[PDB]
């Protein structure tokens, strides 16, 4: 055939892939973390938005740190051979490098490690997107005019 280029990911597999949305709104009292009012709005916007991109969306609410890790692990071991990509949206309290289960924090690196090129071979070479609505610290941006 004619000349070919391959500067863009193949996104015409039979499925776009999973969109996992972890929406943490209510935290165990002993953590001292406040309820994240308005996050259900986010979860619904994301669900609809990625539905229209033809992602298989799964919304999960109020997961402990243990449930987050098991869910990432389980999801990483599914058959992704027919899926173009993988998306994970995390909505929660956080700090630099960290997001919070309802009962305490999870290292971001621990979540993403399940999908490493060598540990999730069905996703090797395929885009793995992590979208993170959470603190990365406590600095505030005062902005500048114009």
């Amino acid at each position: 055939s004619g000349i070919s280029l391959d500067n863009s990911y193949k996104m015409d597999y039979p499925e776009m892939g999973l969109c996992i949305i972890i929406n943490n709104k209510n935290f165990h009292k002993s953590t001292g973390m406040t309820s994240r009012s308005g996050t259900d709005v986010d979860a619904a916007n994301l669900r609809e938005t990625f539905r229209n991109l033809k992602y298989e969306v799964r919304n999960k609410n109020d997961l402990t740190r243990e449930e987050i890790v098991e869910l990432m692990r389980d999801v990483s071991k599914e058959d992704h051979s027919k899926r173009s990509s993988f998306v994970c949206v995390l909505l929660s309290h956080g700090e630099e490098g960290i997001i919070f289960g309802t009962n305490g924090p999870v290292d971001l690196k621990k979540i993403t490690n399940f999908f490493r090129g060598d540990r999730c071979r069905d996703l090797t070479g395929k885009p793995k997107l992590f979208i993170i609505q959470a603190c990365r610290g406590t600095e505030l941006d005062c902005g500048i005019e114009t």
Binding site: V41, N45, G125, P127, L129, C135, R136, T138
Partner: protein
């Protein structure tokens, strides 16, 4: 050939390293509202990094906090695209 085990990840963070991230209890988070709007308007038109750059500008320009507490009033936010992708990503195909 091998590829790096860290290749082909994209981390779309809502805020710069070290910073608070803002969420509106009524409208949702600045970043997520902006991300969905820009995906809706441009997913059939722009490559993903260019979509996320529109999200950066939307959050940067259209939002500013309002607080009775002077420490938290009038603050701004810039999201943070971290890309280890090796190709362009279009959500549509030909």
């Amino acid at each position: 050939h091998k590829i790096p085990v860290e290749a082909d990840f994209l981390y779309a963070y809502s805020t710069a390293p070290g910073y608070y991230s803002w969420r509106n209890s009524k409208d949702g988070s600045w970043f997520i509202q902006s991300l969905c709007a820009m995906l809706k308007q441009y997913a059939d038109k722009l490559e993903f990094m260019h979509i996320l750059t529109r999200v950066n500008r939307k959050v940067a320009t259209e939002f500013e906090s309002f607080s009775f507490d002077a420490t938290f009033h009038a603050k701004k936010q810039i999201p943070c695209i971290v890309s280890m992708l090796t190709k362009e990503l279009y959500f549509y195909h030909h």
